Amino acid sequence: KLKVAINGFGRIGRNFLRCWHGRKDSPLDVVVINDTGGVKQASHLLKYDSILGTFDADVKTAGDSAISVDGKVIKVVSDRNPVNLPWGDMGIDLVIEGTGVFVDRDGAGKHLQAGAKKVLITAPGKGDIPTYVVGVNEEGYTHADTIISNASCTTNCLAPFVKVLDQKFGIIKGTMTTTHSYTGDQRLLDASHRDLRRARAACLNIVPTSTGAAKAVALVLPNLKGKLNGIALRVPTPNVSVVDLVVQVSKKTFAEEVNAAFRESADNELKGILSVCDEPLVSIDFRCTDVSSTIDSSLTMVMGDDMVKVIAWYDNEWGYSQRVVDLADIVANKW
Amino acid sequence: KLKVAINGFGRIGRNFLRCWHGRKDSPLDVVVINDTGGVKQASHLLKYDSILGTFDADVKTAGDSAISVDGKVIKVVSDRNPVNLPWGDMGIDLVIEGTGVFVDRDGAGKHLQAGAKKVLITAPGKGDIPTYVVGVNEEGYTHADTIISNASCTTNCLAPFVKVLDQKFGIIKGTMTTTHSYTGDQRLLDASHRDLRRARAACLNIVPTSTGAAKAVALVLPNLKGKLNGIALRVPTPNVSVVDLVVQVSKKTFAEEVNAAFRESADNELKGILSVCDEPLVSIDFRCTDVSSTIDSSLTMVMGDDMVKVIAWYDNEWGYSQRVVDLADIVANKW
Amino acid sequence: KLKVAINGFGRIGRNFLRCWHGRKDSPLDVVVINDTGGVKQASHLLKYDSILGTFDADVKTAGDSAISVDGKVIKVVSDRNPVNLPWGDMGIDLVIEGTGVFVDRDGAGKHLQAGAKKVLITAPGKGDIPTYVVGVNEEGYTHADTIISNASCTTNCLAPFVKVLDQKFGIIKGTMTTTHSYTGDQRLLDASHRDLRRARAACLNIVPTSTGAAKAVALVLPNLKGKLNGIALRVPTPNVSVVDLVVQVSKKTFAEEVNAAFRESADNELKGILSVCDEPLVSIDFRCTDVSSTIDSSLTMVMGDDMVKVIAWYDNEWGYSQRVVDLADIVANKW
Amino acid sequence: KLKVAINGFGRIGRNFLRCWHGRKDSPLDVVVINDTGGVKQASHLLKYDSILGTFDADVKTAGDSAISVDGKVIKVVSDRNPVNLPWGDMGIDLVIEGTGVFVDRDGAGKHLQAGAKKVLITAPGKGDIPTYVVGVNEEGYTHADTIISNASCTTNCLAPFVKVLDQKFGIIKGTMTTTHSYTGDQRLLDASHRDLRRARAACLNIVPTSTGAAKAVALVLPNLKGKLNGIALRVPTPNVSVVDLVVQVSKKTFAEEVNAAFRESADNELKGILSVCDEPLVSIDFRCTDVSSTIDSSLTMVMGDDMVKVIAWYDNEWGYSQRVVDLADIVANKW
């Protein structure tokens, strides 16, 4: 139904495509991809992937500016400068902005110059741009919004249960580490990088970095402004990340009661978004799970009586892309 | 000077040997090794190691029950049952117990049956056994002690700065995660293990596990009984681990003041035991450092005003072995 | 139809179970598992696996000596000594011997003492034991055979195309390296192992080892006795291995003609066993492929005019288990 | 003595610096580095490295355009376009060209425009450019040569023993695989790359690639023109690579006799360049070895009677840089 274009056909982009493609009765129709990489490359990389594994579809080139996915021809255009793209002419309604570069209203604003009606950025914006997280504040999406964000996938992991915690015990202050699967921009071998931590061999190192995720939460849960801070440690697992959140709450509680509250929500207001796992699983068991955030219930601790600790696993790539589609077809669904 | 025997010549054992061997004017003399592995294997494995790298010494077999290390002949005996070992006859004074199995007074007690004068266990004991951590409570070692422990190397990392924090701001309650290099007992591929978490491929997984380290701290810093809890996440780095400690203190403080307190101690009561790093380093930069614990100062945070967070790197193998020698030559030094 | 028992429920065993379970109209019925590990563990490990990924089935305990797989109850018994097992009473026809230990006629012979009618060993035997490879010599299986082998999965990879090469160009002599995914018996950290190469950290090392595979080929392709030798290099990829075979042939040929011969067979006598890949794929694209051996056609070289080189990818775990079922239901099919 | 400038201060460049710096009585003096990265970064990255480990030196910034290495101030300049660099004014004699980009006489020729007297490229050139390998053809270096190459470090590994083999048994034809530590230009995660093989996650994959090394050998051992071909398989080890060379020789030989010939040369014409290892070592034991190439003698095979197979380990980074200095101080030594 909704005329959809994907800007950028790297990990996030391709990820969105196969996510959308696996859906029951998608309100969305994807007609075009803007990628400078070329049609041969876009095809190949869409079909094969070390993390998501081979795509279960007939993916091939259809001429020299399109790919088919089981017959379904998708168009492929190739401009570096977004103001050019034949959006207008192709009557595009929603752009998935996955390049990572055009995060402001001034960079992303270039898409509505090509004559596109709405833009969804797959990354936090630099102010004045409304971020949204399905399960957290999705209710607040006006149709008037021309440019919207979906935040980091860490924030997509963290916000849902922070909501639950805040709603039910009342976060006073808290801090958080994100044990995080290594990520594209890091260095295979020690080499040049603006972050001297991130210049360093990704496969050999626990590498510390800043995370936007803590302050970023405040954007979608205003009640938490300046109550959280964080750090990330990139580790040599390719995918699947864990958040390690310590908060102090106002309602005296205990480990078991916390876990009950998450289950309460996992079966109700967050069904499909939050899960609670009561099994002794390891990181690679959360590969390809459809939820933003799974609480590892055996690991929840409360010291005592008000400092609560919570460990949640998230699939950094797939779980996030799932949300992007969840957001995109709310945009579509209420037109 | 001190007649020293090493029981068990696996990682911990060999590690102790090359640690001792690199020392200025060692009060210790190592004369015997009890290993069922054999002399060819003990030699080879002592010379070559993926983590510590090739040992800078002439290591070779000397006949069939001894190895030389640059001429210095060390004897090698081979009984499974410790009550047998010719300790008495060889006049052994101090046994480094590195097998991991004989942790109680009833298992380790078997060494003084062979006629050994004192035993040092390289692991926490099961009650009635005094643990000791150099920098923390080493002052309390009586000579009367026949069986002593050195705790986990995690506790050896954590106790020193927990001391500082407790002494200076006063820990009320706190919790802690140990991002930890994977460890020998874990599974290369998914296979049988008492811990279903630990049955799982070590090189592919963030694997959660219990850590003794938090309660274990209380043993050496009694003021902290039941104030700390913890968890570990084994990750696919071979060596070099980080502790991620969140506490609530009673003296309102700020990130910068905390770091000053560690530096205060790193230059004084903990010189050589605690360091503070002001450089943006990554895990593999702490390989082969001589200290129990290095604070990553850029990472210290305080929210607000009393919840303090501290990240410290430790070399799990080398730093710990360094302490074992530090303990062993206190035992020797005051005879 | 065929009454089937699985001895040993580690990687190979569990692998066979989920392989069998995914089949169109299996002639096989699996009724019992002999595993000392326990029912809780066998369930969990059957459901979750880092290499094959979560099993797409309802796997759970059914009482204390059985597991269900989507309702289908499988029995679980637990003796260490095979002569005991209630095979006779349970009327077992075919034992999948996956423990790895009972490879001779004298060790495996213990199963027919429990009153089992035929045994299939999932590893090369020590002489007098007929090995079989589907696609290579499966035609020669008499029903009289009480004990049969399926060789190494390396031999299962190598034999098929060695056949083709031998049949069509005529191998004179040749040599071969198996770049091989690391394997269970290797060491996570440097520690005790009969092979001093294999004592060493698996995740950090290219580790050289002996392979049975070259001489083992001669067993199923007698024409090649003493014409091949090999070595393996274990590498830090978990699964998916490559064979790097150099032969000298008698029929002067060229890279392109060789590849044509494999395709000839991949579409005919080896359809489902050998594939030829004309795509620039990497190791992790061959995960979960159903064939013994995929030729990487872009990589075939001929120097000149008679020294041919061939690179084939194989899934060490899954592809092999697929064959085990292929063998097991030939045994069943011709009763 | 020799006025030396280093162009490019990435892995190869920094590697050369610490290599030169560790030398007995270097005829070389390094006075300048051209790096766009900046002085803070160049310092840090020179001091810390995941592969070579912390540099054993006082490395720090000295003002804003220089670094000190134990007092010894080295200058740091920063132009992208080489024709600009103040070589002339600084009286530079020899440029180490380590950027990788300026490999032709037309790109590298730009350095002698800045007024530099000789250039040494750390990579194969595109024709008309003399390559040199110490131990192989170093005798042929005229002083007239303004632009020289040092080939790939694979060729630096392979050429020495190919020489020995050719000299002593006489290579007729042969083929070769290079199991190779992953390398900078590969992809941390599946992403855009001219080579679709090399676009793929480096840490998860055995990735096949073309190697220049086989044809490249012919350049330094002309007798072997069109007698060798090769392929590489990048694997997830960071450093330390192995060459797997199969040749057919004319002198009927046997495994043991081959190995004797290498030892013959390792103690004579190739002392310090080729070694022969008779120990069951693994890849990570060859870290930081000073030789181009170590033969793994236990692995040599001869089938039969004339197809010889040889496995040699090389340190891709350090061993090569060692040669670069070996070449540079021949240039210096005969002025």
Tab-separated table of N, CA, C and O in Angstrom, chain D residues 123 150 212 223:
chain	number	residue	atom	x	y	z
D	123	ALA	N	55.667	-2.607	-1.274
D	123	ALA	CA	54.671	-3.408	-1.982
D	123	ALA	C	55.124	-3.646	-3.428
D	123	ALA	O	55.914	-2.862	-3.962
D	150	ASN	N	59.940	-4.245	-2.515
D	150	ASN	CA	60.290	-5.307	-1.596
D	150	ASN	C	59.277	-6.450	-1.668
D	150	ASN	O	59.356	-7.415	-0.910
D	212	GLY	N	49.144	-12.307	-5.140
D	212	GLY	CA	50.105	-11.906	-6.165
D	212	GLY	C	51.334	-12.786	-6.114
D	212	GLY	O	52.030	-12.971	-7.106
D	223	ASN	N	63.801	-18.078	-13.217
D	223	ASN	CA	63.772	-19.453	-13.677
D	223	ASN	C	62.388	-20.064	-13.518
D	223	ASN	O	62.093	-21.107	-14.085
